[PDB]
C-alpha cells in the first residue's frame, strides 16, 4: 500500500544502537507531530493518516501518548478506506476516557452503520466487538440483532455482527433481551456461506447457558449439518476444507452447541446423531489420508469434542466402550501433546458407571506414564485420571504409587496430592488399619504439607470406629520412637495416646511412665498448639495412671509451664495442677471420661480441595 | 551423567600422567558423574591418589570420597578409605587435612550412632596442633568437628580451651563462630572457678563485638547467635548494651535483631537511656521495625519496675495515635503487662475497649478477650462485649476460639446469674460443632467441670495465678541448649532445630 | 540474530 | 556444603548456574525468582526457606548471587565465601556487571571449579592461583 | 473464548497484543512477561498446551517467534493449535515468503488479518483462500 | 513558631 | 518519586524541624548523659519536578550520626556539595540526625529533699529556662515522684496549675507559657508512716514534658536553594518558611 515515512521511522529505530539513541529519536517525532497537529493548519487525509499511524506505532513500541485521539476520530469519518482504518484502529487500540470523545466515536460508527457499504459498516462492528464499552451497548444493543437479520445485511456483516451481539451480550447482558430475534438467528445454521454458521454456532452456543428453552431449535439442525459435514465428499465445500478434512473447526464447534443441551427429545434426530458419531470413530481409525502433522491434528480435535458429547450425554454404552479404546490407543502414542490430552479427557470418562470397568483395563499404562513421563503437566493429568479411576479395588495399589509420586513430586503440589490421598484411603476403607497407617506415612513423607483438617479427620476416624484403637495406640507408639520425627505427628500421637493410651500399657515397652517420657522429649521441640495438646494429654494421663501421676505433677509445676509466657500454656497448666492436688478421684474422672463420639458432617478435606479452585 | 560413561577409558589414563598440577582435573570430573557403572572403573585410582608425592592430588582426591559416599556407599572398597582418609589427617600440608576433615564429618551424616568414634588425646591433639597451622577454611571444618566432643573432667576441659583461645580471628565471622559454639559446650569447668572462668568471660566478650564491624550479612548471622550467647550466659556482655544500640542507616534485619538483644541488656540502671531509644525508634519508617519497638516498650515494663508508669503512659499516647497496628501490638504487650502487674492498671480498660472495634489481627483480639476475662467483675457490660465474638466463633483463629471460651466460663463463674445461655452457646459450639477435636475436649471438660460442681470450678479456674516475670519473648531453655551445640551453624540463624529441615 | 527468518519453510 | 550457586540479573533471568549436588533438583532456581526476586515484599532477610531449601543471597549493583543447601551448613561460612568469591572477581575483570559476566563464561566456571569442590570452600588469592587460572587478552573498559 | 493472541520474538518483544477482555496497564504487562517466561525455555519435547492460572495458554514456534493463544479451561486445544497454523499460512500467502519483520512494517496489516479470522475472543474464518478474497480485492480500494 | 528564610 | 507535571497558582515551601532533646542530670546540677534526636520534614508544594540544595551549621559546630531520604545524592564525581536532591512532591522525611556536642538544655530544675526523722518530707523544686527571654515554651509538665507510702500531701506552685495524683504517685506541676532566662518553684510537704525499714526507696527521677520553638542540638536552617531548568521561576520566586519544635523525649534529673 504506502504509509509514507512509517517505513523510513522503523528502519530509524533498528538503526539505533542504544537504549537512549531509540528514545530521543522518538521525542524527535513526537514533537514533529505534536507540532503538525496542535494549530500547524489543516492537513490533507493521506498526512492525517501518516502521522497517526506513526503514533500508533510508537505506542506499540511502548512509549506512552498523550494525544492524537481528537485526529484519529477525525479519520473515523473519511469516506476513504485507509483513513478509516488507521483511524479505527487507533482508538481499538488507544482507548480514551473523554465524554465528547466518546460521543462523536459512537457518532462516527453510527454513521458508518448507517452507510449500506458493508465494508465501512465492516470497520464499525469490529470496533465495538474489541473494546465492548458500555456505552457502545447502550447504543448500538438495540440495533445490532435488526442486522443481523431481517434485512439482506451482507455474508461478511452477519459474521461480524453475530460476533459482535456475543460481546454486547458478555459485557452488558442487560442489554441483549430475548425478542424476535429468536427464531431467525437458528435458521442462520442453514446458510449457505459456512462462515455465517462458524459465527452465528458460537452466538447460540453462549445464549443457550441461560436460554436452553429459547434456543432448543437448533438441536435438530445442529445434527443435520454436522451430519451432512461427515457425509460430504473430498472436493465438496472447496473454500472450508482444511488439509484434507471437512470444516474442522465448524464440526468443533456444532459438537460444542450439542453439549449445551441433553440428547435430542426425537428418536430420528438422535439416531442420524449416533450414525454420525460412529463414523467419526472410524475415520480416525481410517490411514493417515497425508504424512503432514496439520491433518492428524485437526482430524483429531474433531475427534476428541465428540467424545466430550458422547461423555457429556452418557447414554450409548457401545461409543463409550470404542472411545475408551480410542483414548487408550493414544496413552502411548509418540506426540505428548495426544498424551496429555487422553489423560485429561479419560479423566471424565472415569466418572461413569457403563464406562468405569473399561477406564480400569489400563490402569497400568497410567502407572506407567506417572513414572515414565519426564514432564510434569502430564503426570499430574495421570494422576488426576488416577484418583478419578480409583475404587474399592484399586485403592490399595492406587495410594501406593499416589505416596511413591509424593516423594519425587515438588513443592507446590504436595498440599493437594495429600488432601487426595487422604481422602481416597478414607472413602474406600476396607480394614481402617489401612487407613491409620496410610495417614501416618503422608506425615512422615509430607507432613509439612499435611492441613489441618486432614490430622483432624484421622482422629475423628479413630474415636469413631473402636476396632482399630490398639493399632493407632502401637503404630503411633512405634513410630514416635524413630527420631527424624515430624510435629504433625506428635499431635495426632498426643491425642491418640490421651485417650487410647491405656490400651498399650499393658506391654512393659509401652508402659504409661514410658509414653509420657517419650512425649516429653518432644515438648521443647515443638510449636505453642502441639504443647497444649501435650499438656491435655499429660493429664489425660494422670487420670488413667496413677502409677506416674508423681512425676507429670513435677513437670506441671516446673517454673516454666506454670510462669509460662503463652496464656493458654499457663492457664491448661493451672486448672489441670489444681484437679490433679485438689479434687476427688470422681471429680477428677468424670471430668476426664472417654469422650463420647463425633456426630458425622461434610469432609472439611473435600471443602478445601474445592477452595483450591479459587 | 549420560554423556560421560561412553568414554570412561579417558579419565583413567589422564589422572595416572607425569606433571603433579594436571593430575587433580581428572581425579574431580570422575567423582561429579554419578553412575553405578563408573565404580567398575574408579576404585585403583582413587587409591593411588590419595598417597601422592605432591599434595595438590591429595587435596582433590581427600574431596573424592565424600563424592562416591553418595552413590552404592557399603564397599569392602568403602572400609578401605575409612583408613585411607584418617591417615591423611596427620598430613604435613594444610588443604590436605581441611579436605579430609570436610569430607569425613558429612559421611558422618550416615549415621548408626558409631561413626568417627573420638579417641580422645590421640586424635584430639593432632587437630589442636594442625588447627593452628590449618587454612582460613580449614579451621572452620575442624572447629565444627571438635562441637561432637564430650570431655570427662577440668583438666580435659582446660587444655582443649587453652588452645583455642586464641580465635580473635582472621576470617572474622566464619571462625569466630565456630569458635565461640566449641568455647561455649565446654562451659561447665567448676562452674565459675576462682581464674579461668572468670577470664575466659572477659576473652569473650570483644570477639563478638568486633563481629559487627564485618559485612551486613554476617552481622546478621552474628546478632542471630549473640541472641542466643546472652540467653545462655548474659555476664559475658553485661554492659556492652550501648553498641548494640540501632545505627541509623543499618539494614532492617540488623535492626530487629539489635533491638533484641538491647531488651535483654536493659536493667535498672541502664533502662533511662534505653527507653530514650526506643520513643524514637517507635516513630521510624519500616512497620516491622516499629511493631517490635512498641512491643519492647511493654518488655521493659515488665522487666523492670518503676519504669512500669513511664513504659505504661507512653504506650497510651500511642494508643492515641489511632494508627491501627500501633494499637494492635501495643494492646498486645499491655496484656503481658497486667500479668505481672495485677489490679494496678485496670483503669486502662475503659481506653482500650473503644479500640475493640477494629482489631483484626488475631492476637490483638485474644489478648482483648482474656482481658474481659480476668476483669469480668469489673466491667459491667463484660456479657454483652464477648457475646459480640460468638456471631463468628468458626471463620476465626484457633487461638481466639480456645480463649474465647476460658474467659467465658470465667465470667459464667463470677456471674452465673446473668451468663446462662452465653456459656451454653459456647460450650455447644466448642463441643457439637467444634472440628479441632482439641477444642472439642476442653469444651467437654469445662461443660463437665461446671455442671458436676461449682464450688470446685471457682476453685479450679479462678485460682490465683503466678507472676510472668521478665521472661520477655524468652525461648525454650532446653531447646536453647541444643540450638548452642549449632551456634555457627543456620539452625542458629532460624531458631528452630536441624530437625525442622531435612 | 535473523529477526529476518522465513516463517514457514 | 553448597550444594547450588546461582546468578541472576536485576529481571530474574540466570546468567550463571552450578549445581553441586544430589539433593537440590533444577526447579529451585525458579524457587529463588518466584519468592526473593519478585516478592512481593522488599523488606525481608538474607536467608530464606523454601520447602527444606535454604537461599543465601548478597547483591552487586543489580547482580544477584545466591547461594543454596539442604543442609545444616556453618551459614557464616556461605556468606564469607560469597564475600571472598566478590574479591576474586574484582582484581580479574573490574566492575560487577552483566556485561562483565558475559565476557567471562569460561573465566566463572574455572573459578567455580578451583575454588568449590563438592560444596566445600578450598582456598582463595589473586596470587597463589595467577597461572593457575587461564583468562583472555584485552579486558572491559566500557564502562 | 480466547482471553488474548500474543506473538512475541525469542527477545520479548511483542509484535501483536490482541486483548479480547479488558484488563489493567500493569497486569497487561504481567501476562507478556508471563506468556514469555513460560514459553521460551519450552523444547518440541514439550506439549503446546500449558495451564496457567485458570486460564490456558496455546502456543507454537515458528522461527524466532511464538504465537500463543490464551483460551477458556473448556476450549478445544488442537482446534486453536491449527487456528494458529491457520493464521500463520494466511500471513504466508498474504506476504509471499512471510518472516517477522513483515509484521513489523505492515503492522497495521497483520492487524487486518487478524480480525478476520478471529473477533470478540471467538474464531469467525477458517477459510484461508476467503480472507485472501477479502485482502487483495479490498485492499486495492483507496 | 514561623519566621521568615532568606 | 515526583511523577508527571506538577501545577499550582504560586510556588512556596515550609520546613518542619523536630528534635527531642533527652537528658538525665544528678542532684547537685551535672551534666551527665544527653543527646538530641532529630529529623527533617519537607512540605514543598511546586511546579514542574525540581533540584534543590539544601545547607546548614555542620562540623557553627555540631553533628554526630545522620541519614537521608533516597532521593538525596551526596556524591557526584567525590566529596559533597551539601545536601543535594530532587524533592518529591508535598510531606516527606528529609532527614533524620543525632547530636550529642553542645548540648542547650532548654530547662533547668533544681531539687531540694529534707527530711523530718521518718514521719514528714519537705520539697523544693525550682525551674529555670535557658533560652531567648523572647520565645514562647509550651505544655510544660514537670513529675516528682511521691513515695509509695504517703499519707498525704500539700502543694502550692508560684506560677501555673498543679495536683498531688495518688494513683500515679506523682506531683504533675502544669505550666501553660514559660519564656527565656524566667524562673518559678514549687513547694510540697509529704506525710509518711514507715513499716519495713530497709528497702530504701530508689529515688525516681523527676520528669519534664515541654514544647519550645527553638532546636535544642544548635542547628539551624542557612538556606534552601530551589533550581528549575525546563521552566522559568527559581529561588526568588519561592517563598519560605521554617519552623522549629522542640518536642521533650526523656529529660530527668535528681538521680
Redesign the interface.
Known amino acids: 500500500?504506502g504509509?509514507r515515512g512509517?517505513?523510513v521511522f522503523?528502519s530509524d529505530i533498528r538503526n539505533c544502537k542504544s537504549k537512549e539513541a531509540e528514545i530521543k529519536r522518538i521525542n524527535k517525532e513526537l514533537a514533529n507531530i505534536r507540532s503538525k497537529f496542535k494549530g500547524d493548519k489543516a492537513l490533507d487525509g493521506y498526512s492525517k493518516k501518516k502521522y497517526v499511524?506513526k503514533l500508533?506505532?510508537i505506542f506499540?513500541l511502548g512509549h506512552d501518548i498523550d494525544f492524537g485521539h481528537m485526529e484519529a476520530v477525525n479519520l473515523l469519518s473519511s469516506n476513504?478506506?485507509?483513513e478509516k482504518?488507521?483511524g479505527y484502529?487507533f482508538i481499538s487500540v488507544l482507548v480514551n476516557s473523554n465524554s465528547e470523545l466518546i460521543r462523536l466515536i459512537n457518532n462516527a460508527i453510527k454513521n458508518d452503520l448507517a452507510s449500506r457499504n458493508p465494508?465501512f459498516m465492516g470497520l464499525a462492528l469490529?470496533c465495538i466487538?474489541?473494546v465492548?464499552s458500555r456505552e457502545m451497548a447502550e447504543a448500538f444493543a438495540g440495533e445490532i440483532p435488526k442486522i443481523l437479520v431481517a434485512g439482506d445485511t451482507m455474508d461478511?456483516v452477519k459474521?461480524?455482527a453475530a460476533?459482535?451481539l456475543?460481546?454486547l451480550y458478555?459485557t452488558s447482558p442487560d442489554l441483549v433481551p430475548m425478542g424476535d430475534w429468536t427464531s431467525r438467528v437458528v435458521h442462520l445454521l442453514n446458510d449457505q456461506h459456512?462462515?455465517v454458521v462458524?459465527?452465528a454456532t458460537?452466538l447460540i452456543t453462549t445464549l443457550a447457558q441461560k436460554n436452553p428453552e429459547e434456543f432448543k431449535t437448533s438441536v435438530s439442525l445442529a445434527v443435520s449439518r454436522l451430519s451432512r459435514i461427515v457425509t460430504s465428499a473430498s472436493t465438496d465445500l472447496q473454500?472450508?476444507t482444511?488439509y484434507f478434512v471437512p470444516?474442522?473447526?465448524?464440526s468443533?464447534?456444532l459438537l460444542?452447541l450439542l453439549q449445551c443441551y441433553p440428547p435430542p427429545e426425537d428418536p430420528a434426530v438422535r439416531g442420524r446423531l449416533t450414525e454420525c458419531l460412529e463414523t467419526i470413530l472410524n475415520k480416525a481409525q481410517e490411514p493417515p489420508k497425508s504424512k503432514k502433522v496439520?491433518h492428524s491434528?485437526?482430524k483429531?480435535?474433531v475427534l476428541?469434542?465428540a467424545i466430550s458429547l458422547i461423555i457429556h450425554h452418557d447414554s450409548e454404552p457401545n461409543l463409550l466402550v470404542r472411545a475408551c479404546n480410542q483414548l487408550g490407543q493414544f496413552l502411548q502414542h509418540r506426540e505428548?501433546?495426544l498424551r496429555?490430552?487422553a489423560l485429561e479427557s479419560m479423566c471424565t470418562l472415569a466418572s461413569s458407571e457403563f464406562s468405569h470397568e473399561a477406564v480400569k483395563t489400563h490402569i497400568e499404562t497410567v502407572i506407567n506414564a506417572l513414572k515414565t513421563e519426564?514432564?510434569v503437566?502430564?503426570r499430574q493429568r495421570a494422576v488426576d485420571l488416577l484418583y478419578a479411576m480409583c475404587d474399592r479395588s484399586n485403592a490399595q495399589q492406587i495410594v501406593a504409587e499416589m505416596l511413591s509420586y509424593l516423594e519425587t513430586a515438588?513443592?507446590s503440589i504436595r498440599e493437594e496430592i495429600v488432601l487426595k490421598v487422604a481422602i481416597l484411603a478414607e472413602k474406600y476403607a476396607v480394614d481402617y488399619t489401612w487407613y491409620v497407617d496410610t495417614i501416618l506415612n503422608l506425615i512422615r513423607i509430607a507432613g509439612?504439607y499435611v492441613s489441618?483438617?486432614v490430622w483432624?479427620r484421622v482422629?475423628?476416624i479413630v474415636?469413631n470406629r473402636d476396632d482399630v484403637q490398639g493399632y493407632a495406640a502401637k503404630t503411633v507408639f512405634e513410630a514416635l520412637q524413630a527420631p527424624?520425627?515430624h510435629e504433625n505427628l506428635v499431635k495426632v500421637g498426643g491425642?491418640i495416646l490421651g485417650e487410647f493410651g491405656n490400651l498399650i500399657a499393658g506391654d512393659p515397652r509401652s508402659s504409661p511412665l514410658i509414653q509420657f517420657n517419650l512425649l516429653h522429649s518432644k515438648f521443647?521441640?515443638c510449636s505453642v498448639?502441639t504443647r497444649?495438646?501435650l499438656l491435655?494429654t499429660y493429664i489425660k494421663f494422670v487420670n488413667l495412671f496413677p502409677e506416674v501421676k508423681a512425676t507429670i505433677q513435677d513437670v506441671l509445676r516446673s517454673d516454666?509451664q506454670?510462669?509460662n509466657?503463652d496464656?493458654?500454656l499457663?492457664?491448661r497448666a493451672?486448672?489441670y495442677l489444681?484437679?490433679s492436688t485438689?479434687?476427688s478421684t470422681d471429680?477428677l474422672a468424670?471430668?476426664?471420661?472417654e469422650?463420647?463420639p463425633?456426630?458425622e458432617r461434610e469432609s472439611?478435606i473435600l471443602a478445601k480441595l474445592k477452595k483450591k479452585?479459587? | 551423567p549420560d554423556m560421560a560413561i561412553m568414554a570412561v577409558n579417558s579419565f583413567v589414563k589422564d589422572c595416572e600422567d607425569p606433571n603433579p598440577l594436571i593430575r587433580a582435573l581428572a581425579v574431580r570430573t570422575m567423582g561429579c558423574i554419578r553412575v553405578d557403572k563408573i565404580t567398575e572403573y574408579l576404585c585403583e585410582p582413587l587409591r593411588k591418589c590419595l598417597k601422592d608425592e605432591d599434595p595438590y592430588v591429595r587435596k582433590t582426591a581427600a574431596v573424592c570420597v565424600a563424592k562416591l559416599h553418595d552413590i552404592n556407599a557399603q564397599m569392602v572398597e568403602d572400609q578401605g578409605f575409612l583408613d585411607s582418609l584418617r591417615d591423611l589427617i596427620a598430613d604435613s600440608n594444610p588443604m590436605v587435612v581441611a579436605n579430609a576433615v570436610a569430607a569425613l564429618s558429612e559421611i558422618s551424616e550416615s549415621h548408626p550412632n558409631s561413626n568417627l568414634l573420638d579417641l580422645n588425646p590421640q586424635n584430639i591433639n593432632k587437630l589442636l596442633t594442625a588447627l593452628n597451622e590449618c587454612t582460613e577454611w580449614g579451621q572452620i571444618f575442624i572447629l565444627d568437628c571438635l562441637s561432637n566432643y564430650n570431655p570427662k573432667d577440668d583438666r580435659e576441659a582446660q587444655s582443649i580451651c587453652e588452645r583455642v583461645t586464641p580465635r580473635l580471628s582472621h576470617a572474622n565471622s566464619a571462625v569466630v563462630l565456630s569458635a565461640v559454639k566449641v568455647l561455649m559446650k565446654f562451659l561447665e569447668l567448676l562452674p565459675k572457678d576462682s581464674d579461668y572462668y572468670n577470664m575466659l568471660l572477659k576473652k569473650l566478650a570483644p570477639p563478638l563485638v568486633t563481629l559487627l564491624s564485618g559485612e551486613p550479612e554476617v552481622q546478621y548471622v552474628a546478632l542471630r547467635n549473640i541472641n542466643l550467647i546472652v540467653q545462655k550466659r548474659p555476664e559475658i556482655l553485661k554492659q556492652e548494651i550501648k553498641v548494640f544500640f540501632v545505627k541509623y542507616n543499618d539494614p532492617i534485619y540488623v535492626k530487629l535483631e539489635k533491638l533484641d538483644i538491647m531488651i535483654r541488656l536493659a536493667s535498672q540502671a541502664n533502662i533511662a537511656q534505653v527507653l530514650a531509644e526506643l520513643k524514637e525508634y517507635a516513630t521510624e519508617v519500616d512497620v516491622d521495625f516499629v511493631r517490635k519497638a512498641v512491643r519492647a516498650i511493654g518488655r521493659c515494663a515488665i522487666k523492670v519496675e518503676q519504669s512500669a508508669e513511664r513504659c505504661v503512659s507512653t504506650l497510651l499516647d500511642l494508643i492515641q495515635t489511632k494508627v491501627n497496628y500501633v494499637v494492635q501490638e501495643a494492646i498486645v504487650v499491655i496484656r503481658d503487662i497486667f500479668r505481672k502487674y495485677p489490679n494496678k492498671y485496670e483503669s486502662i480498660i475503659a481506653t482500650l475497649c473503644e479500640n475493640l472495634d477494629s482489631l483484626d489481627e488475631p492476637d490483638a483480639r485474644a489478648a482483648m478477650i482474656w482481658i474481659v476475662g480476668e476483669y469480668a467483675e469489673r466491667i459491667d457490660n463484660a456479657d454483652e462485649l464477648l457475646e459480640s465474638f460468638l456471631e463468628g466463633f468458626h471463620d476465626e483463629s484457633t487461638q481466639v476460639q480456645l480463649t474465647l471460651l476460658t474467659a467465658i466460663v470465667k465470667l459464667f463463674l463470677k456471674k452465673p446469674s446473668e451468663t446462662q445461655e452465653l456459656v451454653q452457646q459456647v460450650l455447644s459450639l466448642a463441643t457439637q460443632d467444634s472440628d479441632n477435636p482439641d477444642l472439642r475436649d476442653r469444651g467437654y471438660i469445662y461443660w463437665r467441670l461446671l455442671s458436676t460442681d461449682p464450688v470446685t470450678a471457682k476453685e479450679v479456674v479462678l485460682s490465683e495465678k503466678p507472676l510472668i516475670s521478665e521472661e520477655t519473648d524468652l525461648i525454650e531453655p532446653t531447646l536453647l541448649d541444643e540450638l548452642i551445640c549449632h551456634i555457627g551453624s543456620l539452625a542458629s540463624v532460624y531458631h528452630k532445630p536441624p530437625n525442622a529441615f531435612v | 540474530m535473523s529477526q529476518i527468518k522465513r516463517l514457514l519453510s | 556444603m553448597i550444594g547450588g550457586l546461582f546468578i541472576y540479573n536485576h529481571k530474574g533471568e540466570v546468567l550463571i548456574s552450578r549445581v553441586y549436588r544430589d539433593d537440590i533438583g533444577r526447579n529451585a532456581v525458579d524457587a529463588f525468582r518466584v519468592n526473593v526476586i519478585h516478592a512481593r515484599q522488599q523488606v525481608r532477610s538474607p536467608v530464606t526457606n523454601i520447602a527444606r531449601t535454604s537461599f543465601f543471597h548478597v547483591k552487586r549493583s543489580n547482580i544477584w548471587l545466591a547461594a543454596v543447601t539442604k543442609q545444616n551448613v556453618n551459614a557464616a561460612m556461605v556468606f564469607e565465601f560469597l564475600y571472598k568469591m566478590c574479591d576474586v572477581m574484582a582484581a580479574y575483570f573490574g566492575k560487577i556487571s552483566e556485561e562483565n559476566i558475559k565476557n567471562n563464561f569460561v573465566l566463572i566456571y574455572e573459578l567455580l571449579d578451583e575454588i568449590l569442590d563438592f560444596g566445600y570452600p578450598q582456598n582463595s588469592e589473586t596470587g597463589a592461583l595467577k597461572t593457575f587460572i587461564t583468562q583472555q587478552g584485552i579486558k572491559s573498559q566500557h564502562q | 473464548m480466547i482471553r488474548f493472541i500474543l506473538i512475541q520474538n525469542r527477545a520479548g518483544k511483542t509484535r501483536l497484543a490482541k486483548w479480547y477482555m479488558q484488563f489493567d496497564d500493569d497486569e497487561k504487562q504481567k501476562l507478556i512477561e508471563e506468556v514469555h517466561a513460560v514459553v521460551t525455555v519450552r523444547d518440541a519435547k514439550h506439549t503446546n498446551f500449558v495451564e496457567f492460572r485458570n486460564f490456558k495458554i496455546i502456543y507454537r514456534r515458528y522461527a524466532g517467534l511464538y504465537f500463543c493463544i490464551c483460551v477458556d479451561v473448556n476450549d478445544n486445544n488442537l482446534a486453536y493449535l491449527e487456528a494458529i497454523h491457520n493464521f500463520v499460512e494466511v500471513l504466508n500467502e498474504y506476504f509471499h515468503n512471510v518472516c517477522e519483520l513483515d509484521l513489523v512494517f505492515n503492522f497495521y496489516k497483520v492487524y487486518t488479518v487478524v480480525d478476520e479470522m478471529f473477533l470478540a475472543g471467538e474464531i469467525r474464518e477458517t477459510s484461508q483462500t476467503k480472507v485472501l478474497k477479502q485482502l487483495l480485492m479490498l485492499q486495492s480500494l483507496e | 513558631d514561623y519566621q521568615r528564610l532568606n
Open positions: 500500500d504509509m512509517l517505513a522503523i499511524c500508533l506505532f506499540l476513504r478506506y485507509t482504518q488507521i484502529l465494508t469490529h466487538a474489541n465492548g461478511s459474521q461480524s460476533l459482535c456475543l460481546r458478555r459456512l462462515g462458524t459465527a458460537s473454500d472450508y482444511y470444516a474442522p473447526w465448524l468443533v464447534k460444542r496439520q491434528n485437526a483429531n480435535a476428541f469434542e505428548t501433546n496429555y490430552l519426564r514432564d503437566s502430564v515438588d513443592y509439612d489441618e483438617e483432624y482422629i475423628q474415636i527424624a520425627c491425642y521443647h521441640l498448639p497444649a495438646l491435655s516454666s506454670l510462669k509466657a496464656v493458654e499457663q492457664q493451672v486448672e489444681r484437679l485438689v479434687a471429680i468424670t471430668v476426664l471420661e469422650m463420647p463425633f456426630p472439611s479452585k479459587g
